[model samples]
Target: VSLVATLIANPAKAALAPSLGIKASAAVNATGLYWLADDIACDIPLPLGMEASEADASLRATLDGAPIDVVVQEQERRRKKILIADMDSTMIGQECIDELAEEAGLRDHVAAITARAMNGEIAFEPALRERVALLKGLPLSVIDKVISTRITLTPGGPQLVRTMRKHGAYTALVSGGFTSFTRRIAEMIGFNEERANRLIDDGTRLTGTVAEPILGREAKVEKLVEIAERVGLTPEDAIAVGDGANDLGMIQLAGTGVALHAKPAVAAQAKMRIDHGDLTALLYIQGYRKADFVQ
Candidate 1:
């Protein structure tokens, strides 16, 4: 049976190289197509900037002459299902933790840790603690200020969510960041539910410890499974979007996991990478046109 998908990628470009699957016949087709070098978009020469060279190479290996297996899901076109998205670098342009550090006068000190964390140079839990420690003694209200004034959704995030909901897809904000921030953004984006890490607060002050363990790579994967179960669909019916190594698991799990303006590692591995546009590109890829937009 033929399948109609909202968006399909090589999985390598979707940042899902490790856990991705291939279909028998499609694997055979991919083997024939592998020798040709092309961009993740599959038309132009893979660009020089970013990790296009590495992304291109990894994808090549997966396309052997033997029939490679593949996975495809139904989008329902007009009745899509769920969307699980990352908050920090995905929904908003700035890492909220880093931005908070800057506001608290610890930019240089905390940003260094953040950079290392993103590049995989530091342990996720420890680095997160060290980073949050910098905000120790800061007032809880600082979170309110950041949410009210500093937090801005990435261009097209709201539009993407609204359009998807209009088409009957359930949207969720699943974040490694604080719940205070994610819940607000999720509401703004019209998401159906929100899940995220919680910062401990004592009456009026910050406790300097996160309530939940840092939501790292594994939590992301687990959340994908949890959400899929809630929606009564397999991993094949979901779409997970993120921009970091922590997002690798869900990106690999979803039927169409988009690495929107992702890091080098994430961009290279995501089956469908988007570097040139806003989240609205997702709508376009999902077959939504200008006329279909609500705003």
Candidate 2:
């Protein structure tokens, strides 16, 4: 059997298609042609019947591979649910802990540890504990200072959240950072939920401790899955975007995964990468018409 379809974008990322040993022909600068060579009795991609509109000719052939005869059909998925992430490099340019390290007179000391932790050189929990331990006896008010001085939201982040929420999508600010900053930012940008690592505080002193069971990779994945299940949709109906090594699992599990201005490992593994644009790249993959986005 042979399957045929048209891909409608330049720099076509046919990651899932070429796996079936499908051959291709260039249709136009914006068009891609795909044909599959499977042993099922099929004349066309959707052999029972096939039609194409001028706007969409993307095809999914059932005989291409898999259990069910699934054909790629052009459909519209609204901006229903999205995770509005922050509390790390995404909400602001600096990692909160890294910024705190500098404040506590451990700039060189903590930054090296931060680098190791972020780069997967060490276990995140131990790396985090050791780093926090370095800040012991530093002022408790540094959290406020960090919020005031170092935390600056990314360009286009506020607008991204507002617009996504306006479209009826549930927006969340999940983080590996702290609740102090994330709670405030979520309120500022109108988030539906906020999840993050919590800082432990004593009565006007430093504790050098965090809440139990840190919200690491597995936590992020759980939240993503939980949100998807709550929304009565598959993970395919969700979008998770992040830039750090710790966000890999959640980003990969989401229905539409994005690595926004990511680290090298994140950019390489993510299904989609956005280097030169805003969160609107998420809309583009959903087959959203330009008219759907106002700003």
Candidate 3:
């Protein structure tokens, strides 16, 4: 089968069943089926002419609303050479700004703006500027506390990055968030490089400013293109994943654009959506089995 379909479920839930995989295989006339991670992920060979949308529709119909994520890809480039991922709410579980806002005692206000901005309701640049302005005069040290106590890394993140790089992919953490946290999260998640906006600080406290030329949607697209070229790969050789408005550009540009547990309005446009699985879903989409992972 030149085309393949990967079905995945959240690691913690393990909700994907063998009979469900069999039903999907029959619906799509899939030739063979194999488990990637027991009940967490499975792959099936589909008839050559089927497209991603049709297969997804078939799976949805065949599985009867099962909590599974399906992504179809051609065998030739199923495994990407470059990975561009968003940091906030993608790799990690919290929006850094919202956590920072809580430290500034403005969680209610900043979180509202964050939701709108991430959902594409408001322009990213203006929303970010206004939010940062509100955070003005807040102490810089609050970042350490927030990072330590508030942020939670997404499940199976390390296995995803390490496994990809283990097979020669270059992983990068690119965020519309701040550098203070991205650097730390990158190391924690083992990314090859990290990029983000720098929060302006005056020795001890925030100056209520972020460095110029905010890395919004355009910058994200720009970075994706730049990194693809620098790594000697085309956009088709990369997989971009994120869950916000700013991530849409890169997500649409890469070989596999996965909207991972994203905002509804924004996520629908991604080439693939993985609402159930963890980051390791990326590996499954690339045809990696559980035994192939570095960890």
Tens-place lDDT digits, model 3, residues 166-251: 99999999999999999999999899999999889999899988898898999988888899889888989999999998999989
Per-model TM against the reference: 0.73, 0.72, 0.97
Instruction: For residues 202-262, write the lDDT of model 1, one tens digit per residue.
Output: 8887788887567887888888788788878877777788887777788888877888778
Please name the candidate that would achieve the greatest TM-score relative to the true structure: 3
What TM-score does model 2 achieve against the real structure? Answer: 0.72
* Candidate 3 global CA lDDT score: 0.89
Tell me the TM-score of model 3: 0.97
- RMSD score of candidate 1 (Å): 9.5
Model 1 CA deviation exceeding 4 Å by range: 1-80
Colliding residue pairs in candidate 2: 60-72
CA lDDT, candidate 2, residue 154: 71
Once fitted onto the true fold, the runs of candidate 2 whose alpha carbons sit more than 4 angstroms away are: 1-80, 84-86, 287-295
Q: 159-249, model 2: which lDDT tens digit per residue?
A: 5666677677777788887788788877876678899887777867568888889888778888877887787767666777788777778
Q: Report backbone clashes per prediction.
A: 16, 1, 0
